[PDB]
């Protein structure tokens, strides 16, 4: 990570404030409300007249 | 509303119609779960306080880690060691659990000596790569984290009646370097930001 | 030699950056003026050039 | 430099200068007993361009930064009012030329 | 108001000579360092998102020098703190016998009563300055847990805006100040050029008076009022600093 945060394969003596390269998100979650109801698209787009 | 982070239960107070709450500068940090109506809290999946102390690649491969302003009890919680590689988890806990006033310093052992500072670390503490391998039995050259030597202590013996006078002087020649100029440069208008076109 | 060397290095380093930063896309499709001029017509390549 | 300055020498360096400073840097200190003034004949007899330094049962005037003992003459010291004032004055005979 | 007007009365033959002096103690403050800071590359300008990470990698590599510059600044600060208080490497312990003439020096010297070696005036100056930034340790646990409303320190830490601590502890600077004080009150000014050479404080005062042009027999003929004036000046400095709270 120290090599990457300053972009070099050779790192000399000292202290270095590295960037964030350790943790990568691996799981995705989705939370949507309980609706389970469709629009009247068939009652609107298939109307007798507009 | 999508985003990356770490969720956690929280005691935040939300208005009945409110759905999310932002940070100081337009950063949604506490969302409300729609399926349970309970309040969650989003913390960034990034803790930037990690300072790596190295003796140089062409001197060794061991390194020390300094997490900023944390105890050595929350470091696996802070950096999420459970989601990290085993090599990183080695630098999370262990035997070298030295704690300083600028976060603790897993990776390097602490000594009671007062050697002169080699690599500054934080408030008072320094570190150095020492060839203790001969001193510490069969172990290897290692990184140590001492406290700085404040020069050397001395006594004057005032005594309220005493004069001190030199008898033999020592002419000394000292070198002091000072930069007086820097390499002047010039830049072309078009040939840099447009080349030739 | 210390600081007497350092300033020189600094200057050189700055110049090196001023070259190594010519490869930054800055939002353009490609950080190569010739490539944009050869791939896109003036009216559409103008925004990338700006 | 660090000690008392004597002289300096400049040397050119790439885009810079190097100063060689010559300094006194006294050493080999010895600590003796001392007094601020000697009340001789009821006179303070303060030292002039020097300090009072006493060896075993002796007294001398010496320069501040070097050990140059000298006998207590009337030219090495100057008087100023009765010595009851000086706090810590050690009385001694103040030798005199012209005698 | 252009100050106050005054007349001198030249008269072409007239000598003005003082008869009674007034020792004065004046306070002058000087900043020697500033709070070093560091900033993370992606945490600020993309938060936490892989898509913005890709777009930043494609956009450029600016931060590679930004942090560098800030890094240099940090180093500079340390050097400043290491250049003002570390003039002499030797530490001189406080004298064991407190008889520096009539001078007391009971407030400039370190205070053994308090566990910290912060003398008296140093602690008062610590209390006068209201350090409101993230100087006190704002641990990550405070930001994560036991939180009710957002504060700016947590936002700074979360957006990568970290603040490094100074290399030298305030106790360390206190030790330097105590060492310099002991050297300048016991050895006069010799330790600034060579070793510590004992000078009785009356002799040092005579040295300094001879330096300023006023010959000896002015200190020695009457030094009790000089020490009283110095003590009164120290007391006035303490009172002004503890009351005004504006210096
Ligand atoms: C929304 O629907 C989910 C189911 O999809 C509900 O979750 C269930 O809650 C009951 C009671 O706590 C549990 O016994 C079930 O095991 C849960 N199932 C799942 C899959 O979560 C949720 O309670 C509903 N919320 C609202 C507000 O209606
Ligand atoms: C100056 O005189 C003293 C008094 O005898 C010599 O001894 C020192 O006394 C002080 C105070 O008790 C101690 O702290 C020192 O440790 C003593 N000497 C040492 C260096 O051990 C002192 O040696 C004299 N200075 C000289 C000869 O340079
Ligand atoms: C040296 O100093 C001591 C202390 O002041 C002198 O002792 C007294 O001096 C006064 C003034 O001469 C006399 O009136 C007293 O009778 C002295 N009493 C003692 C304790 O002896 C001493 O006389 C001084 N001697 C010299 C060399 O002048
Ligand atoms: C000697 O000092 C006195 C102090 O009063 C001078 O008198 C004052 O001089 C100033 C400047 O000319 C005037 O503004 C005051 O009004 C004077 N006051 C008095 C009381 O006369 C005096 O001038 C000085 N010496 C001389 C003669 O020049
Ligand atoms: C020198 O300073 C010390 C500082 O402690 C003075 O000691 C204190 O004096 C005050 C009265 O001025 C007392 O109320 C305190 O109880 C004293 N404390 C201690 C620790 O002694 C001392 O009096 C001063 N001496 C002078 C005036 O030179
Ligand atoms: C010089 O000034 C000081 C300061 O006022 C004088 O000392 C004062 O003397 C008076 C009368 O004895 C006292 O009431 C004050 O308390 C003293 N103050 C101090 C701080 O000492 C001194 O007398 C003056 N001397 C001359 C020659 O003018
Ligand atoms: C590493 O150091 C050694 C000894 O100075 C030297 O011989 C070698 O060429 C160096 N190699 C690298 C990686 O710079
Ligand atoms: C220093 O010594 C103390 C006991 O005097 C001990 O408790 C501590 O662990 C030591 N620290 C080291 C060896 O780093
Ligand atoms: C004078 O000083 C020298 C050097 O310290 C010493 O050897 C000698 O005995 C002293 N004589 C006296 C007591 O005056
Ligand atoms: C300290 O020195 C002064 C100098 O005048 C003297 O009067 C006093 O008696 C001395 N006291 C001690 C502690 O020897
Ligand atoms: C660290 O430990 C100290 C000592 O118990 C405590 O006061 C502080 O709150 C702790 N901080 C964290 C973040 O756990």
DSSP labels, D20-77: EEEE--EEEEEEEEEES---BTTB--EESSSEEEE-TT--EEE-TTS---B---SSSE
What DSSP element (H or E) covers B125?
strand B125-130
- State the residue for tokens 């250049």: E83
| Nearest CA owner, ligand 10 atom 10 | B160
Please count the other Cβ atoms lying within 10 Å of the Cβ belonging to residue D68.
13
The residue to which tokens 């008062």 are assigned = E124
Q: Which of E192, E238, E201 has its CA nearest to residue E98?
A: E201
**Spacing, Cα D56 to ligand 9 middle (Å):** 6
Cα–Cα dist E31/E48, whole Å: 38
Strand B109-110 with B142-147, pairing: parallel
Residues on chain D touching B163 (C-beta within 8 angstroms): 31-34, 51, 53
User: Across the interface, which of E140, E143, E186 has its CB nearest the CB of B158?
Assistant: E186
Give the bridge partners for B39, in sequence order. B32
Question: Residue D83 has which token pair?
Answer: 């010595």
Smallest CA–CA distance, residue B183 to chain D, in Å, is: 8
- Atom 6 of ligand 4: nearest residue by CA position: E9
What distance in Å separates the CA atoms of residue E144 and residue E158, rounded to the nearest whole number?
10
Continuous H helices in chain E: 41-46, 50-59, 63-84, 121-128, 140-144, 152-158, 170-186, 201-212, 224-244
D46 vs E contacts (CB less than 8 Å): 216-217, 220
The token duo for B101 is 């006033």
C7–D14 CB contact, under 8 Å: no
Torsion of CA E92, E97, E99, E100, to 10 degrees: 0
How far apart, in Å, are the Cα atoms of A43 and each of A36, A37, A38?
17, 14, 11
CA–CA gap between residue B122 and residue E36 (Å, rounded): 12
Q: How was this structure determined?
A: cryo-EM
- What residues contact B99, with CB distance under 8 A and at least 6 apart? B71, B72, B105
CA torsion sign for A15, A16, A20, A21 is: negative
CA atoms within 13 A on the CB side of E120: 14
CA B183 to CA C5: how far, in whole Å? 12
Residue B36 is given by DSSP the state T
Query: Three-state DSSP class for B158?
Result: coil
Q: Cα–Cα distances in Å, from C11 out to C1, E131, E197?
A: 16, 37, 47
Q: Are strands E90-92 and B152-154 parallel, antiparallel or unpaired?
A: parallel
**Neighbors of chain D by Cβ distance (3+ pairs < 8 Å):** B, C, E
Nearest Cα neighbor of E37 from E74, E81, E2, E78 is E74
Give the Cα separation of E202 and B157 in Å (integer): 16
Whether ligand 9 lies within 6 angstroms of the CB of D33 is answered as no
**Structural element, H or E, at residue C10:** helix C3-20
Q: Do E61 and C21 touch (CB under 8 A)?
A: yes
User: Beta-carbon neighbour count of residue B2 at 10 Å?
Assistant: 6
Question: Taking the CB of residue B103, how many other CB atoms lie within 10 A of it?
Answer: 26
D25 in contact with B at a CB cutoff of 8 Å? Answer: yes
Would the CB of B183 count as within 6 Å of ligand 1? Answer: no
The answer, yes or no, to whether E and B have at least 3 beta-carbon pairs within 8 Å is yes
**B149 to chain D, closest Cα gap in Å:** 22
Task: Kindly state the greatest CA–CA separation across chain C.
Answer: 55
Q: Which residue in the block uniquely carries the two structure tokens 């100087």?
A: E135
Cβ distance B79 to A23 less than 8 Å, yes or no, reads yes
Starting from the CA of residue D53, give the closest ligand: 9
On the CB side of E185, how many CA atoms lie within 13 Å of its CA? 22
Q: Which two tokens stand for residue B42?
A: 């989003």
Residues 63-102 of B with CB under 8 A from C: none
The order of strands in the sheet holding D51-54 is: B163-169, D26-35, D51-54, D60-62
Report the C-alpha gap between B118 and B126 in whole angstroms: 7
Is ligand 1 within 6 A of the CB of residue B35? yes
Within 13 Å of residue B189, how many CA atoms lie on the same side as its CB? 0
Residue C40 DSSP label = S
Determine contact, residues E238/E122, Cβ cutoff 8 Å. no
CB contact under 8 A, A16 and B63: no
Size of interface C-D (CB pairs under 8 A): 7
């Amino acid at each position: 990570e120290t090599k990457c945060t300053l972009k070099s394969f050779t790192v000399e003596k000292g202290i270095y404030q590295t960037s964030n390269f350790r943790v990568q998100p691996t799981e995705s979650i989705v939370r949507f409300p309980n609706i389970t109801n469709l629009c009247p698209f068939g009652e609107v787009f298939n109307a007798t007249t507009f | 509303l999508t985003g990356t982070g770490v969720l956690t239960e929280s005691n935040k107070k939300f208005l009945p119609f409110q759905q999310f709450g932002r940070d100081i500068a337009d950063t949604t940090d506490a969302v409300r779960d729609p399926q349970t109506l309970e309040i969650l809290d989003i913390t960034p999946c990034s803790f930037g306080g990690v300072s790596v102390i190295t003796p140089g690649t062409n001197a060794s491969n061991q390194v020390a880690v300094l997490y900023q302003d944390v105890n050595c009890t929350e470091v696996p919680v802070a950096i999420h060691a459970n989601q990290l590689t085993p090599t990183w988890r080695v630098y999370s806990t262990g035997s070298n659990v030295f704690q300083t006033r600028a976060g603790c310093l897993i990776g390097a052992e602490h000594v009671n000596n007062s050697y002169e500072c080699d690599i500054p670390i934080g408030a008072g503490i320094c570190a150095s790569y020492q060839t203790q391998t001969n001193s510490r039995s069969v172990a290897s050259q290692s990184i140590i984290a001492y406290t700085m030597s404040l020069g050397a202590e001395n006594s004057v013996a005032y005594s309220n009646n005493s004069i001190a006078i030199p008898t033999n002087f020592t002419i000394s020649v000292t070198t002091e370097i000072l930069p007086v100029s820097m390499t002047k440069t010039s830049v072309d208008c078009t040939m840099y930001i447009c080349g030739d076109s | 030699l210390g600081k007497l060397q350092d300033v020189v290095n600094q200057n050189a380093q700055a110049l090196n950056t001023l070259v190594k930063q010519l490869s930054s896309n800055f939002g353009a499709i490609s950080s190569v003026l010739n490539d944009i001029l050869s791939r896109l017509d003036p009216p559409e390549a103008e925004v990338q050039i700006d | 430099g660090k000690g008392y300055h004597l002289m300096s020498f400049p040397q050119s360096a790439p885009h810079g200068v190097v100063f060689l400073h010559v300094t006194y840097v006294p050493a080999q200190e010895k600590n003796f007993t001392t007094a601020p003034a000697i009340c001789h004949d009821g006179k303070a007899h303060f030292p002039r361009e020097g300090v009072f330094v006493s060896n075993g049962t002796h007294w001398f005037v010496t320069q501040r930064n070097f050990y140059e003992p000298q006998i207590i003459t009337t030219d090495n010291t100057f008087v100023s009012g009765n010595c009851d004032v000086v706090i810590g004055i050690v009385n001694n005979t103040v030798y005199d030329p012209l005698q | 108001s252009l100050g106050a007007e005054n007349s001198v009365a030249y008269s072409n033959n007239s000598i003005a000579i003082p008869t009674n002096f007034t020792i004065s103690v004046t306070t002058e403050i000087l900043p020697v360092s500033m709070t070093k800071t560091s900033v993370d590359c992606t945490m600020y300008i993309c938060g936490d998102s892989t898509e913005c990470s890709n777009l930043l990698l494609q956009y450029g590599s600016f931060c590679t020098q930004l942090n560098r510059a800030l890094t240099g600044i940090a180093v500079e600060q340390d050097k400043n703190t290491q250049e003002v208080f570390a003039q002499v490497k030797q530490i001189y312990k406080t004298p064991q016998i407190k008889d520096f003439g009539g001078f007391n020096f009971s407030q400039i010297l370190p205070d053994p009563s308090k566990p910290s070696k912060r003398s008296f005036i140093e602690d008062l100056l610590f209390n006068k300055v209201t350090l409101a930034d993230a100087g006190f340790i704002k641990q990550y646990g405070d930001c994560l847990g036991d939180i009710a409303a957002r504060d700016l320190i947590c936002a700074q830490k979360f957006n990568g805006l970290t603040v490094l601590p100074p290399l030298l502890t305030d106790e360390m600077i206190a030790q330097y100040t105590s060492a310099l004080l002991a050297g300048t009150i016991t050895s006069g000014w010799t330790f600034g050029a060579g070793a510590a050479l004992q000078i009785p404080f009356a002799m040092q005062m005579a040295y300094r008076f001879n330096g300023i042009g006023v010959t000896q027999n002015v200190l020695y003929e009457n030094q009790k009022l000089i020490a009283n004036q110095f003590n009164s000046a120290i007391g006035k400095i303490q009172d002004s600093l503890s009351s005004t709270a504006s210096a």
